[PDB]
Amino acid sequence: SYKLVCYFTNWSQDRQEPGKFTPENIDPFLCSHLIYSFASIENNKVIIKDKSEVMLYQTINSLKTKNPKLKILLSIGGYLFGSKGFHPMVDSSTSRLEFINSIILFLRNHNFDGLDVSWIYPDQKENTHFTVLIHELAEAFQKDFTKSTKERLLLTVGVSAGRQMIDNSYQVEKLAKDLDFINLLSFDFHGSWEKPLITGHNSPLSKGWQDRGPSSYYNVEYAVGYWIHKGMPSEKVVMGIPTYGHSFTLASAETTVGAPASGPGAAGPITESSGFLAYYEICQFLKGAKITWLQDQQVPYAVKGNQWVGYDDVKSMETKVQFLKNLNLGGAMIWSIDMDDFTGKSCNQGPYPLVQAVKRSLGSL
Numbered sequence: 001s002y003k004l005v006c007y008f009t010n011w012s013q014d015r016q017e018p019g020k021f022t023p024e025n026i027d028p029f030l031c032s033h034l035i036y037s038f039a040s041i042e043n044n045k046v047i048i049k050d051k052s053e054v055m056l057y058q059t060i061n062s063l064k065t066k067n068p069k070l071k072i073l074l075s076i077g078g079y080l081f082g083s084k085g086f087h088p089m090v091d092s093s094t095s096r097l098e099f100i101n102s103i104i105l106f107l108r109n110h111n112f113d114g115l116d117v118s119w120i121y122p123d124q125k126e127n128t129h130f131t132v133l134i135h136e137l138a139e140a141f142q143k144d145f146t147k148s149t150k151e152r153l154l155l156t157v158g159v160s161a162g163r164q165m166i167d168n169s170y171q172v173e174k175l176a177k178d179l180d181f182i183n184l185l186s187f188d189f190h191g192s193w194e195k196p197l198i199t200g201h202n203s204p205l206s207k208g209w210q211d212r213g214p215s216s217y218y219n220v221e222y223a224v225g226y227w228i229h230k231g232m233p234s235e236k237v238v239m240g241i242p243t244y245g246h247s248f249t250l251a252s253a254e255t256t257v258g259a260p261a262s263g264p265g266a267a268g269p270i271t272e273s274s275g276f277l278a279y280y281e282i283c284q285f286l287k288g289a290k291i292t293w294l295q296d297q298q299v300p301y302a303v304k305g306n307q308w309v310g311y312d313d314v315k316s317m318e319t320k321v322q323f324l325k326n327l328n329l330g331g332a333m334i335w336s337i338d339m340d341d342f343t344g345k346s347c348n349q350g351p352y353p354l355v356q357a358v359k360r361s362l363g364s365l
């Protein structure tokens with residue numbers, strides 16, 4: 001039994017085609033779990049800020065009628081929300097209790113199966129707050145189940161794949177008791193924010209030939225091994241796989257991993273954010289590009305003109321699924337299905353080429 005946990009986002013609705021996504025684009029049988037990104041916190045209570053909020057509820061109810069086994073979770077956190085978003089809610093047990101009670105009511109009222117807490121990232125400063133918040137949610141969800149005729153609300157967390165951040169942020173053995181599973185954020189290993197500013201892959205499975213010492217932690221295999229080492233049962237690790245890539249503008253003629261970059265890559269036409277591209281943008285980028293498969297890191301990168309893009313393709317999906325099966329992981333998580341070529345129109349490999357390849361690979365005996 002493997003999970004396929006699929007994040008989708010509430011900002012993809014604002015994009016033009018072929019990136020214009022709403023919950024109606026969701027195939028109810030594509031994933032085992034869907035996670036809505038992201039809720040907000042107002043007056044210490046959970047809400048959803050989304051012009052299409054009430055239509056989301058319609059889709060939730062429709063999806064769960066079509067596939068009664070489907071679980072749909074609500075996520076709070078994400079990069080933009082940061083640590084600031086969790087204040088003032090986390091500042092006392094009183095304000096945290098307001099929040100936890102709001103969560104139970106909201107999830108039940110709106111037919112959600114659970115909560116994902118994706119705090120990006122606690123670090124030293126918020127380690128205690130994150131830990132207590134998770135512990136209090138877990139306890140409250142259990143108490144609520146003790147009294148309910150309904151299923152216990154699930155509790156998951158999106159967590160760092162970086163060793164140092166993991167060490168600083170988490171009390172892993174406690175997290176292993178409190179969480180149903182972790183959504184391991186095994187991507188954003190490299191990108192245009194790095195100093196020195198050199199090319200590197202978003203989500204390498206394995207270490208680079210040039211990696212030594214601390215740089216040898218910056219890959220998926222290491223991250224998964226580290227979480228397990230720290231006490232997370234392998235079956236509670238749901239390994240994140242990205243459907244976006246990180247891009248660089250090259251500073252010289254050199255086009256290899258670790259070549260100098262002047263900055264992020266050119267923004268994609270649809271996502272309009274220099275430094276990343278959705279898969280449906282990558283399929284356009286690849287026309288006229290030279291693609292290299294890294295034998296050391298087991299992932300591709302492509303170069304065209306002065307642009308360098310490290311991304312994940314169908315070969316990477318099948319490779320990463322074989323790896324997670326070999327390590328007895330709980331499944332795969334996707335960030336995010338609304339950046340796969342969900343329409344099928346860009347890549348000409350049918351709808352959701354990456355996620356279908358994950359599903360097919362997971363299901364293959």
Ligand SMILES: CC(=O)N[C@@H]1[C@@H](O)[C@H](O[C@@H]2O[C@H](CO)[C@@H](O)[C@H](O)[C@H]2NC(C)=O)[C@@H](CO)O[C@H]1O
Nearest residue numbers: 077078079080081118120158185188244276335
């Ligand atoms: C589950 C989780 O918390 N994922 C994080 C995401 O927040 C982050 O994606 C980024 O989210 C921002 C909002 O917080 C978006 O504005 C931004 O477009 C988005 N970037 C991409 C490429 O999807 C992802 C990926 O970096 O990982 C975590 O950091």
